[PDB]
Symmetry: C3
Subunit: 138 residues, 3 copies
Amino acid sequence: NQINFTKLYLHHTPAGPEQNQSAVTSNDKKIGLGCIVVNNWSVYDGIGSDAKLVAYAKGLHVFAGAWHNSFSLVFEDERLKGSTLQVMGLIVEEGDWAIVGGTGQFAMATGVILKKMQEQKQYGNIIELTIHGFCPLL
Amino acid sequence: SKLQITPCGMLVQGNQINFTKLYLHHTPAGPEQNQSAVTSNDKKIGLGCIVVNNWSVYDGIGSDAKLVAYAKGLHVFAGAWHNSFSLVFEDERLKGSTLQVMGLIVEEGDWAIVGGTGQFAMATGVILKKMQEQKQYGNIIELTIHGFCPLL
Amino acid sequence: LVQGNQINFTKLYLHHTPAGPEQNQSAVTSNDKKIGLGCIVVNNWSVYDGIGSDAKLVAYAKGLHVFAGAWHNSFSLVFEDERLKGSTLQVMGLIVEEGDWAIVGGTGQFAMATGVILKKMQEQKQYGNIIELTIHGFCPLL
């Protein structure tokens, strides 16, 4: 039994008037790593001007040749308020992420999250999320 | 290197562990301060502060309580506090066994048990947070551990 | 019960190089002298299939470790070999040069991986050390 999730759309905005992340450390010129970025990525349930906010991706990603992410996917949805998905994995725009756990309605969750670039804007981009999660809450 | 793959089965509801009446001392200030911020929030964005924590965990409230574990890790502010730490136990019967914890919010809410080592290998579950006592230099947070350990 | 596969890695050798011309990590924050914690190091540890000059690089440990009395780790173990290219193992735990690590997830060929990673000191060098990794994990079928 797989959780029937809709495709989510993460707004990754590094700069601009709607910037939702910030770098707190920089990369060492000798090694080429070390940059840490704290992010509060907004996550919508769809595309378009009437898409509503349903979750936040609150955490950080560090650059060590590739970006290693660690964030809580906390749901602002009315029915799923409080429940979170715990995500850890490599790369922001493409690749996969691991569902290492969850809380509330998604307690003891496990699965993966597929990422796909959908739109590149001037100060950010939108990343499509496909969640293949499983919950033994039964 | 060598990678072996063996088909088998996983007993999800193998060993159920339930720890009640655990109290974490979250002390951001004072002489007993057990954490420190190493970055500050970006004044334009409103986030970025990273705090490294070594929270002590006791088996009760009062003077008869004894330290049983340390919450060693970090928590970063991105509108709320996202945690990530190893709950390493220090008592005799559980020395070495750790619980890997991730989740939002420190004072309340729920934390996710994403793994463990030693006696808590492959552990999954949740940790319930509840405000127990507010103090001058911080607060005591009651923890309620509900999880499972697969046996395989 | 859940049908799956028990994955067992042996003889993986991680290069932990804090200094030298092959340094593969860098501290970004310092320890707070008042409390005794706060040092954050971002690490890109190389993992090889053996010891010696004939060893091939098979994976990277990309993440970070913070000091709070001990070293709390969080990183992705992404493999570089052709068969496992892109697949990762999500790892969290305490101590770098010894002890146990926990497998909290995985992607690609190791989706929903759960288990532990054992560490053991092998070679102590002037600029770093080499840690042998033994992985005992489980992945559910598909």
